[model samples]
Target: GTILIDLSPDDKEFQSVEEEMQSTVREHRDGGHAGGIFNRYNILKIQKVCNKKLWERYTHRRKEVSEENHNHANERMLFHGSPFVNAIIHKGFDERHAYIGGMFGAGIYFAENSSKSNQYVYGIGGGTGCPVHKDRSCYICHRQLLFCRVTLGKSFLQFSAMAHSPPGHHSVTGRPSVNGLALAEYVIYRGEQAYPEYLITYQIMRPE
Candidate 1:
């Protein structure tokens, strides 16, 4: 029901996403805490997910959202990380299954910083199995990330948690604030608002 086409390392499509990940990492300083893990990553594979059903739904939604936004979808390609790689490839993003609290609200999340999304890219080999979710220190080798095209039609930007999607907006761009954010975040309440166009499998480094 789905086709995952692997992109050659030499393919321009593959190179573009990899370069974007590298650039985003270079632009961010580890600052004072967390991240930089993604900085050291070496992508193992990049696959273009082709699903007529899912892709068509997303493309159509884009037009629908564009009309609602005065002919602008305000689209953005963002990074998403999760161990749920298998599910995302075939089923697309699920705003309902996040393993963590939605401080930005109950919706599918995305980030500009690969490191920001890196927070969720853990426990891949199912290593020894970390019991506590907050302890991202458990996983060792192999992680996955999704590069998705998101429709941020008439986006609402804010600096705090909102339990509901803003009245007039189709998405939320969570701003950095003293409340506990280090990078820009995006969240959309609708699943069809995003298409998981690329699936990336990577390793942090020369994993011994």
Candidate 2:
């Protein structure tokens, strides 16, 4: 089962984390992005994933990857911007739902910055992962992004690769030379390599 803890209004740690998110958005706007952050309202801590087995498997694979990558152990907290918060919280991230063709091929994509993740809000700005906003209660939308601890063992930079990883590599990274990515984009092929650590529920600043 999923155990999510709500941050107290006076929580110091979350306060700074929220500030980091807000600043990241404003910083991205300063970089001349047409779209930017609105505001971050709630940050729920994922104390535990859907099951212990999931976390155990993730950690196990992580250790193996780290060792194989020459002990780099380059684990990172990345932002996965999407609408399937509840689904991921309950069942974990499913790659089948993703449509093909990303900057780093057909894997789960993540960003190093919240602003880059914000651009792909499911119901906002027509990002990928289209949702059929049909009903009225459903027509009303909620914005969410996942702060995932992605174990990027040997995350090789891709120039024009869509295939899985090269023999030793475990994840994919894209940057300025690849797709004009101002920040870095990470892609992981295996689902067990990530732990969705936190979920942020926020308000979006609609364009004027």
Q: List model 2 lDDT by residue over 87-132, tens digit each.
A: 7777776675342567566788887768677666563333433245
> Which residue pairs collide in model 1, if any?
none
Q: What are the root-mean-square deviations of the candidates from the true structure over C-alphas?
A: 4.6, 4.9
What TM-score do all the candidates reach, one by one?
0.81, 0.75
Which pairs of residues clash in candidate 2, taking residues 3 or more apart in a chain or in different chains? Answer: none
- What is the alpha-carbon lDDT for the whole of candidate 1? 0.73
Clashes of each: 0, 0
